[PDB]
Write a protein that binds this ligand. Sequence first.
Ligand code: MET
Length: 531
Amino acid sequence: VEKVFFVTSPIYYVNAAPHIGHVYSTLITDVIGRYHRVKGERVFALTGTDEHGQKVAEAAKQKQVSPYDFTTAVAGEFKKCFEQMDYSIDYFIRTTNEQHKAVVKELWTKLEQKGDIYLGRYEGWYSISDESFLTPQNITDGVDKDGNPCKVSLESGHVVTWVSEENYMFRLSAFRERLLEWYHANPGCIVPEFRRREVIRAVEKGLPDLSVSRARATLHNWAIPVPGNPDHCVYVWLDALTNYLTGSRLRVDESGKEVSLVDDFNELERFPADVHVIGKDILKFHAIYWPAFLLSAGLPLPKKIVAHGWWTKDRKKISKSLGNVFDPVEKAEEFGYDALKYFLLRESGFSDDGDYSDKNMIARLNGELADTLGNLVMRCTSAKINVNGEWPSPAAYTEEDESLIQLIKDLPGTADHYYLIPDIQKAIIAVFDVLRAINAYVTDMAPWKLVKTDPERLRTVLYITLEGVRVTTLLLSPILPRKSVVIFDMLGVPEVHRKGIENFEFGAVPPGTRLGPAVEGEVLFSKRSTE
Ligand code: MET
């Protein structure tokens, strides 16, 4: 099934400025997209902002501005931040978009015509901050911002309020069996595995019907009207999840501006998502509600949902109100963009809540990027070792030579599998296991002595090293997109050989290829003092 590989991030609430969590989710989306482009596939990578709802409306009122001006301004902050982060995202969607609204109304009407929406009541707890309905088992006692006793979410700790409203209800209870059948038929469809198990357990227990509208006053009229009923607004989450469908149907011009909404998703060959990237906090929406809506509407289901953890800094919660900020742009200016991306993707897996510190950041940058990767690139390109400034023609390979070559040949298949799970941390570790092996081979062969002692042997050692650096760098190119270009330039790898599965093969760059010119004193990753 040849198709556009479709990868998404969440669309973020615009109640406040963008921060590490948004940057991280979008980074993961970006990396997955980049890897599939490197394989020569068609890719559409989507990110954006979730701009309706009571949460956003009350954030605007607290700043005392119009919701239109507020959402526009904060959406602009997200766009600027992502531009600065140097992603390769194909479209940035906003739920205030008029074509998105049309797709939401269309989907609603399909659900209704299917018989899965009825007029009922919700009486229960709601978290405005999570826009989430909660049972009494999912709240506990806590304190409000005036210090008074209130109820709070056990999941998020935000304040909950009791809602009692005549609402349109979606028959979620009727999809239990079909959802379980979907999880069991596709046991890789939620990653990591323990989060898949959580979803299955939750759905096993039973599902209540879900409120998919609210009275218009509650939302301060900042939402999409229910087709045929002006007194109701569409649940912000049904509106929000629909962004994935809208995005799959938007034709986008060179400037990244939407110019047309197509009638049917098949026309652009994107829907359904191959990967939805999300945080663990929004798993039920994506793994339970979304597939149920899609089943009701007769739409195909996503292939994989990958849910990551939440970051801390110096083992404490990241917060402006407390004394612990973590600004990605600032840290990227300090340590480098590719380096910061590397750290975020290497330091933690999707099953973990990662922790940043300047100490650990510096140790990875010095140890892995400078001492392992950078040092190797400089060694095989130096005029002192590579006297002719080119890829030599290798002579006969020893067993030691071949053992390293085997690792280099095996690497693409292994990295590929990890990128597809996806488990980016493991992909990175696999590549760096090969970089460490190449370094120990270089140390063991001492090519600097071979220049005088055995130039023929040096040709072999040097060729293996160059090719190892090239293959590893290609597989890291989604992680270090700017630095990989610098590496390929230093190596003189022609543009055509910088992507495509043909170039996963050992030996793709021929002997006699000239290295790129040298710039005096210009290192790849400069080591930084440990403060
Ligand atoms: C359809 S993904 C919506 C995610 C939600 N706006 C959030 O920031 O958590």
